[PDB]
Design a binder for this molecule. Structure first.
Ligand SMILES: CC(=O)N[C@@H]1[C@@H](O)[C@H](O)[C@@H](CO)O[C@@H]1O
Ligand SMILES: CC(=O)N[C@@H]1[C@@H](O)[C@H](O)[C@@H](CO)O[C@@H]1O
Ligand SMILES: CC(=O)N[C@@H]1[C@@H](O)[C@H](O)[C@@H](CO)O[C@@H]1O
Ligand SMILES: CC(=O)N[C@@H]1[C@@H](O)[C@H](O)[C@@H](CO)O[C@@H]1O
Ligand SMILES: CC(=O)N[C@@H]1[C@@H](O)[C@H](O)[C@@H](CO)O[C@@H]1O
Ligand SMILES: CC(=O)N[C@@H]1[C@@H](O)[C@H](O)[C@@H](CO)O[C@@H]1O
Ligand SMILES: [K+]
Ligand SMILES: [K+]
Ligand SMILES: [K+]
Ligand SMILES: [K+]
Ligand SMILES: [K+]
Ligand SMILES: [K+]
Lengths: 320, 321, 320, 320, 321, 320
């Protein structure tokens, strides 16, 4: 049973913000400075997740949380530690940008893990108590690693986003596969930022957000895009539809955003003008989807909509 | 013509004061608008018309016509304005922003930052704010902040402009040019450069012309923006200068202080924080009233009021020339 | 008798903001745009200060102010002018970043003085009416000059911060001495920005804030640190303890910040996301300290704490 | 009778260097540092030109020169000074990049003229003794202004190259017309730099060189292209064919260059790795063309070819 | 195999010495070649073969096969090498540079910097140097300086690489990766970073693998390039390291001094001034002789010679680990 | 007796290169990569110097050398190590840019000393065998520190050049005084780069070269200037005359350079297009001066001229 608020009266938008935003405040932990990625999944008869909680030292750590209702979170004060046989991959430097999904028999966590710069860390859990760390999937510099929630033609699949070691001024989404969660390959380009004249909210760089959502015609991808203004980056998010069998083949890609920084909690904070989607919960029998997104790199917010309406919007407004 | 007006508050000593109704145009007036923050406004018939920059939810820059009975409450067309053009190449639409409008002699002219292998100044005319006829782009890229004078200067059309680059330009002088025919342009003259940081830092990075010049007996009143580069971005403020009536590239007085700078929440939070960008004015020489339209945070449109003679006085008193 | 508010009920922070913030508004003077450094000291029956008041031409000027309570200030409308026999040094270009302290027999004012670029200007006063300018202490480019409030083994001492001629993307704190307030030397490195992975609020650049506060466990240094986000700089502030006798030797340095931009008056304004500490009043008998800080380069705020608590926080959280 | 050297036996190149290169040395004048644009034309008995000669102050000045054979030049020691009735336009700041051609009844000179940054200066001369300055054709920033040698459908026509106020990192060629040599307009884009993967010698920026040469198949445009290596720009040059009646319409554009820096005089100098074409003399009866080019921004060189061979090369290798 | 060789010049105390015949390959060997400066060379039958980076007079980067009896005088094919691939997406040619070639078990493999939405490491194999069969690109962009080990390491193929950007990259660490199958890659391990400027400035900006690692009893001998960033550009020098045999990401010794730096006119002047870029080596374990191929000023190819044990001695003696 | 070559026949230049250049080659020492500052003085029976010799690790080290004739040098293989009781200042990181002169009773050496970035190191020797390190004169970032060869009104005096921590894109010359060779002050701006349109060889940055040369008319300062081309920096050098009593007051300053990179040893090497003057020897009786200068940051060269001729050239071509 997923978090839900009905479409506000008179609202014509395909996605609408929770009137209770933010749902997770910056100061939930005794030394939290900000809490703004919430990689959430159903777990048991409630919910679990891995949260980016930056502390008052501005260190980036991951913490486990649990919730009965997916809105009020009980986040562990101790940062998440990963078990690793290999001491060098198991060395912690930093971590941010978590994503979590269930694949076949267990939950997988990806995050941007420091190993001589940003790359994609990978781990699994059965219980959100012990996490077994796997090889980093890629060589740096890479982030916005997002696994598909089932195998594709008998291989694990992940979207990713080649980066640099700074505030990267570019970014294409890529797709890769693995037979074993250890060795990765068959890299395919998915998409590039759009031209400024076509769709400027996604003209500087783009990156995958929540775990891809399967629909009968393809994968619904919710992804961030950046616009470079004279005064900074503005992060908005939107939707695309990927081919089911070869998800690097993009079928439709929204011209308009789904959501952009509007509210004071999106516009003011540690990084102004940021809506960064990180997770979603959905129900295919009602079409309902709830999208979790970071707000100003400070707090966490929720937005709601219907999958069929998002799909119709993505096709009708498509730039491809 | 009855222009909008609010009297200055009790105890306010400022030369310009904001409308208590700001923002006068909201970001979501149209079903697909993301922001509406340039308002090129003129008297038209028994009321007012304008060309508005309305950026949509794809963050595309388009121009839309609007009409108003009082110049405060606007009815803006949902569909973007399309230009008619004799020439297919010039007529091709890439993007448009930064509109300005004025009447010269027998018709309304519209200039805008028109994409043609980069930003340049598009030119068109209209008799009715329904059909627009596009003329040659006035200049080669890169250029924007094109603003016509509202009459010919010694028998030639005249336009202020602002040589630019293809990004968020880190420099910018105002220039003046003439044309006998609205097709060929020349006699380019430098008007002014940014001020020295230690003299007037609100206008030390770059400058550009705003509203159409307003003719006064003490010269053309130019209201123009200026940029300060802080560690966290650009701050856009605006101020005033007086140009020679006959040779308007000769600046006679230029203000040290700004007239208006970002202060209010609607100016300090939005798509581009800390921007007050003036785009149009309405004025009444009988009363000396002036109403200046300005975009706020690249999100919404606001209005500010003052008196022409008080602005002239301020410009002279505080002149850095 | 220093300004004080009790720590809010339930508040676990070492420093807490005044509920009266901002204490100095942007428009206090007829031509002020912003008022955000407040170099304050006790004087006579109350308080005096040197204030950075940027005007509506965005020029950077210094003005003298007086207060009876150190909260409600009466600032002179006319900028401060300095007396100097040397016309070359005496030439005013611009001035910002003032700091003020009494040393032995008079008050000294330092500021970021334009002399072919930013350097540290120096002047004294006996009465806060007439100010007499001394030689600039250093060659450009330097700022964040902050004198010790007594001589150190017989010499005047000053912290500074080598810079460039723009929005400096680096910054270490240095220490220098002078026998005579004219010739300076014995330059020693104090500290550098921390590593991003250890303490990111202070990983781009740092600079000294208020006059050092003598304690039995060392000089308490309150200093700003910068984090470079994709959208610009975020200024926070924290604490270090310097050796009493050789103050370039850092004994303890906080990991977490003491204060970071949170309130709308800190997050929105001429320069968003800035808390810049400029002065402090303290009472060794009660342990109370009141720290003045510029907010968003627009207004002035106050924050309160106890010196023993700040000492304890600095030591327990030390990254060295 | 234009200069000529026959193609060496076995030489397969479309263009070949004079064996006498450099034809103008850097120290020809008592104060010359370098001499490296040579805007040459037939005049009377022999030849005349306008030369960029940078002095030992590294100032950029134009000088008039005369030659019997177009190879050995007698350049005037004193810079060229223009007569102008408008004192504002007639103010000399700097000048470089000259081009000279006869149109109708007199010689026109264009150059990169300082007027609050680079723009295209214009003047005329009947005798190469007195030069009369006209209005600058465009607003800054622009350079590489090159006139057509006759009117095009009753209007003067000029190629130009919108620029910035530095070492410009971009550059498209544009075309403009004027009824009167005063007011300019009908601006049209001619061509942009090529894609890196298609033709990298011309992928950063391009600019017109010699006066266009009229042929039955279009205007022969010889133009420079830049490649941005890790160690700077490399200037090469190539060929295109423009429509006769509407010269902004490009018919053919070479993939390969015609000439690139190879010789020590091209690869070592004030600006290493530069071949910058500035003029040509040609003879339609024989098809001979002689192209003048600056070498390393230090000296002037000559290269030879046949117009029909250049045309066949431009077509065969066309990237349009 | 008879590897090229010249004895050390009389009086010469350097560990490596340039051929007196340099450049051994000129820039205009082919009718349309602009420059020829990577030479990925191996023994083949009775002579030598290689894959050469020949940039053309359009300044396109292509790979060409060549053959030589002596490894000094090369017969390079006029037409660029084409790869067979049955996946059209991966088999699309955009550009290629930076080849390296070695024999592993049953065939020759060739890696190169292959354009696939930016630089990455392309991989192919050949049995005969006539037909080349392309495999998956080994990594996601941006990467280059991919260099295979000449045997499997504990049953897996192994490759050095170099994470990059899509420009003239201002950074660069060498990495190591493994693959069981020449298709999927993983077990990524950091090998080394640029040195500190105050320790060894020829290798302080970025580093990258050069020739195929050469196996010694004392480790893998890695010859690699290093960049120094002067006010006027990058200077590429090359030096030596020894890697653990079994875990080649563990560096045992790393030279402080360079082995070779741009000195000669053919190294200092050309398309990219001040570049010595090593691309291949031939060696003879019986004699200890090694011949190192290197690109000179991105224009021509040179040769340098030395003795493996003397290089090992120098690497240990001068080690900055 | 200082080295001398008479001006080549007909040569009209104020300064002329030695026909023996380069006088010091790059490979004098077993591990030298380049040898290109040579801070030279008369000593005992001949000459002594401190030389910048970068090694084959590209480390910057200073070495002592001696010569009978000041042309052919015997440079010590071992780098120079300074004696210093203070362990903090005595720590060696790197050193370059040496300058040497005799002041009153001993030889002083300054150099660009690494101390948390570049600053001016200072030391003395009586014998060119043992060198005794003093305090760094300034806080970083600074270089091109050049002492005057006597006291000025009872104080030691030094030119310097505020910098940054990279390849500095700016640079003015400053003057400072010290009563004791420990504490420094009375900082005065000497000169800034010229405007591009006035004198482009010196329009990016400038810095002092050889020790100032006393004349009856003022101090002859030989200094470098930088021009920023598209392909890098070009270092040339020229002359100014400073007031004898107040040497920050410039009396005349040359518009043209004295010398600029022309020869292959100046235009090809580790840093192309560099002539960097570092020391001079002179004879007041004859007016002869021999100027040592770094060539392409690879080798050392010599140029000769006459002090009165240099002075008249500086006056006649003065840009102030
Ligand atoms: C603590 C901090 O500033 N972290 C940021 C991270 O939030 C961001 O996503 C990345 C890219 O812009 O840069 C930094 O790693
Ligand atoms: C869509 C968008 O971000 N447009 C901006 C425009 O508003 C701005 O005026 C111009 C110059 O700074 O840059 C961009 O074109
Ligand atoms: C008027 C203005 O913008 N002044 C700022 C000043 O506040 C700031 O501290 C300094 C460094 O960032 O740069 C500028 O001088
Ligand atoms: C003196 C000097 O360096 N002049 C150059 C000029 O030669 C060049 O064409 C232009 C663009 O790169 O920049 C500068 O004006
Ligand atoms: C054609 C051309 O300039 N190619 C270069 C290539 O040689 C170089 O290795 C790379 C990194 O600097 O940049 C470009 O791809
Ligand atoms: C080894 C090396 O590259 N040193 C240079 C030095 O020669 C130069 O003067 C300084 C300023 O450009 O930068 C670097 O420190
Ligand atoms: K795709
Ligand atoms: K003017
Ligand atoms: K210290
Ligand atoms: K065209
Ligand atoms: K390692
Ligand atoms: K001076």
């Amino acid at each position: 049973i997923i978090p839900w608020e009905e479409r506000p009266a008179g609202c014509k938008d395909v996605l609408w913000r929770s009137v209770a935003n933010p749902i997770i405040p910056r100061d939930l932990l005794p030394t939290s400075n900000s809490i703004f990625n919430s990689a959430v999944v159903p777990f048991g008869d409630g919910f679990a997740g891995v949260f980016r909680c930056d502390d008052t030292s501005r260190r980036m750590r991951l913490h486990v949380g649990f919730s009965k209702d997916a809105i009020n979170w009980n986040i562990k004060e101790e940062p998440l530690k990963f078990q690793c046989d290999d001491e060098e991959i198991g060395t912690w430097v930093y971590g941010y940008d978590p994503r979590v999904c269930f694949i076949e028999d267990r939950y997988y966590v990806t995050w941007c893990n420091g190993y001589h710069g940003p790359t994609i860390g990978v781990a699994y859990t059965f219980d959100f108590e012990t996490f077994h760390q796997l090889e980093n999937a890629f060589i740096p510099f890479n982030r916005n690693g997002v696994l598909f929630p089932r195998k594709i033609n008998g291989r694990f699949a992940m979207l990713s986003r080649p980066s640099d070691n700074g505030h990267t001024p570019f970014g294409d989404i890529f797709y890769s596969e693995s037979p074993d969660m250890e060795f990765w390959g068959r890299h395919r380009h998915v998409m590039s930022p759009a031209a400024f004249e076509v769709s400027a909210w996604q003209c500087t760089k783009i990156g995958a957000g929540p775990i891809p959502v399967e629909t009968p015609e393809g994968w619904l991808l919710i992804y961030h895009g950046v616009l470079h203004s004279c005064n900074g980056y503005v992060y908005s998010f939107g939707s695309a539809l990927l081919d089911l069998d070869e998800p690097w083949k993009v079928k439709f890609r929204s011209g308009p955003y789904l959501l952009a920084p509007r509210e004071p909690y999106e516009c003011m904070g540690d990084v102004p003008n940021v809506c960064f989607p990180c997770a979603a919960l959905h129900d295919n029998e009602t079409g309902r989807i709830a999208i979790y997104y970071g707000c100003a790199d400070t707090v966490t917010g929720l937005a709601f909509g219907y999958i069929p309406e998002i799909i119709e919007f993505t096709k009708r407004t498509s730039i491809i």
